[PDB]
C-alpha cells in the first residue's frame, strides 16, 4: 500500500504556476516572522484568462 | 539552555516542518469574491482514496 | 503599549490592501478576500453605505479619492 501510494502521488492530477516577480510587490519573501511567505508555504494564484476569473 | 546544550558556531540544525496542513485543516482553493475554502483530507480504509471534508 | 488596530484600506491591487497602525498582520485575517473594484472615469454622484459594530460616537472614518489625469490640462 505505501509503495502504491508513492506511485499514486507520482501519477496524480496536479497544477503548477511558475511566476517571475519583484520583492515587496505587494508581498515580502522571507522566513516566518519576516516575510509573508517562504519555501514550502501554501500560496494562492489566479490565471489570467481562466473561464471563472475570480478562482 | 545555552550553557546546558552548548552548540558550536556553524552547527547545522535539522528540523522537519509541516507547511502543508492536509491532514488537519488547510485550503486547496477558493474565490477572490468569498475567500478560501477550509478543508481536511483523510485516507479511507483502502489506503488509496482520500476523502475531503469541507469546514 | 501599541496603537490600536486603526487601519488604512487601499483598494489598489498593487499594494497591501489593509494596513494597521500597530503593524499587526490584519491583511492575513481576510481569508484571501480582495477589494476588486475601482471608481470608473467620469463617475458623478455615488452613495457609499458602510456598517459598523463595536464603535462609539465621536470616532470617524474617512473616504479618500485620488485625482490622476493623463494630461497636464484638459480632459474634464
UniProtKB/TrEMBL annotation, chain A:
The organism's place on the tree of life at top rank: Viruses
Protein name: Minor tail protein
Originating organism: Mycobacterium phage Bxb1
Taxon lineage: Viruses, Duplodnaviria, Heunggongvirae, Uroviricota, Caudoviricetes
Gene that produces this protein: 25
Residues included from the entire protein: 492 to 546 of 600
Automatic annotation (TrEMBL), chain C:
Superkingdom, natural source: Viruses
Name of protein: Minor tail protein
Organism per entry: Mycobacterium phage Bxb1
Parent sequence residues shown: 610 to 685 of 685
Amino acid at each position: 500500500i505505501m509503495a502504491a501510494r508513492a506511485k499514486q502521488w507520482a501519477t496524480r492530477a496536479k497544477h503548477s504556476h511558475e511566476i517571475q516577480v519583484s520583492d515587496a510587490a505587494p508581498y515580502i519573501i522571507g522566513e516566518r516572522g519576516h516575510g509573508h511567505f517562504w519555501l514550502g508555504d501554501r500560496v494562492g494564484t489566479t490565471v489570467l484568462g481562466y473561464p471563472d476569473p475570480y478562482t | 539552555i545555552a550553557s546546558l546544550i552548548p552548540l558550536r558556531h556553524g552547527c547545522l540544525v535539522w528540523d522537519i516542518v509541516d507547511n502543508s496542513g492536509w491532514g488537519s485543516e488547510t485550503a486547496f482553493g477558493g474565490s477572490l469574491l468569498t475567500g478560501l475554502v477550509r478543508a481536511v483530507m483523510n485516507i479511507a480504509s483502502d489506503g488509496m482514496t482520500e476523502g475531503i471534508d469541507i469546514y | 503599549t501599541y496603537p490600536a488596530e486603526n487601519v488604512v484600506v487601499d483598494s489598489d491591487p498593487r499594494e497591501e490592501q489593509v494596513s494597521s497602525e500597530s503593524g499587526s498582520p490584519i491583511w492575513e485575517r481576510m481569508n484571501s478576500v480582495r477589494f476588486l473594484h475601482y471608481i470608473p472615469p467620469y463617475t458623478g454622484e455615488v452613495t457609499f453605505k458602510l456598517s459598523v459594530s463595536g464603535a462609539v460616537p465621536g470616532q470617524i472614518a474617512t473616504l479618500r479619492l485620488p485625482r490622476a489625469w493623463s494630461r497636464p490640462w484638459g480632459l474634464e
